Design a binder for this molecule. Structure first.
Ligand SMILES: CN1CCN(Cc2nc3c(oc4ccc(Br)cc43)c(=O)[nH]2)CC1
Length: 273
């Protein structure tokens, strides 16, 4: 039971449920305690043994490793109307949405470091057979001391497959035009569209499209000064036709992506950590 955890302040809540800061009583390890309401669970899965759990738990177990770029599931509990996930908690930490709110558009060197790290975290998820489906600033945490990003929140995710998805419940303004128009997308190229909306958001300080019509037209306007190489990569990730978008390898070989900072260097220069 959760006499093993001291519950601290609420960190956030939403369609999925609520999350609290917590501390594991035995060793004082910082954790986050996420309560997932059953009736809001968009997908269920089951365990190697074969217990009926949120898909989110299946996905988190598939990606669990010593790789710090994806959040680690430490433990979980079932309750009558909810599950309770116990997750790693970096400290001090700030999500990327709040970081951008506070700091505005990010210098390119900082955006390059963060974007590279996110691409390494997403490639790990895909190599583990997991499609995240809600990559966006609020689902990325920054371990401020170490300059390391972590992808969180597999609540909209699915097992990765090579055929079409026809369901989607992640964030609409990050979803690609083929979802908006046809309600169908493939995993990797929809991931890459969202990576293009994320990199825009980092270098311009806001997302590029609010309305369905803007998504489907796909015309990108730069509202801040951004280098032509960065603009070229963003407009490549946001190719209207799915098969026109780059693969991960093509993104990480892009001229804009070269000479990325190490995370510690990133913390020292940009995060004062
Ligand atoms: C769109 N998503 C829905 C869930 N929402 C809450 C959430 N927070 C955390 C989650 O993992 C964490 C690990 C450490 C810390 Br600190 C916070 C979290 C998570 O899965 N959801 C983030 C935004």
């Amino acid at each position: 039971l959760e006499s093993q955890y001291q519950v601290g302040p609420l960190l956030g809540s939403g369609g999925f449920g609520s999350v609290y800061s917590g501390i594991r009583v035995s060793d004082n390890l910082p954790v986050a305690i996420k309560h997932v309401e059953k009736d809001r669970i968009s997908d269920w899965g089951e365990l190697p043994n074969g217990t009926r759990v949120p898909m989110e738990v299946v996905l988190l177990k598939k990606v669990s490793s010593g790789f710090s770029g994806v959040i680690r599931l430490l433990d979980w509990f079932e309750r009558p109307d909810s599950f309770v996930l116990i997750l790693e908690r970096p400290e001090p930490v700030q999500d990327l949405f709040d970081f951008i709110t506070e700091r505005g558009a990010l210098q390119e060197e900082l955006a390059r470091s963060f974007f590279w790290q996110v691409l390494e975290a997403v490639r790990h998820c895909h190599n583990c057979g997991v499609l995240h489906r809600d990559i966006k600033d609020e689902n990325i945490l920054i371990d401020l001391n170490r300059g390391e990003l972590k992808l969180i929140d597999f609540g909209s995710g699915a097992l990765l497959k090579d055929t079409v998805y026809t369901d989607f419940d992640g964030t609409r303004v990050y979803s690609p035009p083929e979802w908006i128009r046809y309600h169908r997308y493939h995993g990797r190229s929809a991931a890459v569209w969202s990576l293009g909306i994320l990199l825009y958001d980092m270098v311009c300080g806001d997302i590029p499209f609010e309305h369905d019509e803007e998504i489907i037209r796909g015309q990108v306007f730069f509202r801040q000064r951004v280098s032509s190489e960065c603009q070229h990569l963003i407009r490549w990730c946001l190719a209207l036709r799915p098969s026109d978008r780059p693969t991960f390898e093509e993104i990480q070989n892009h001229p804009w992506m070269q000479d990325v900072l190490l995370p510690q260097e990133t913390a020292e220069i940009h995060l004062h950590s």
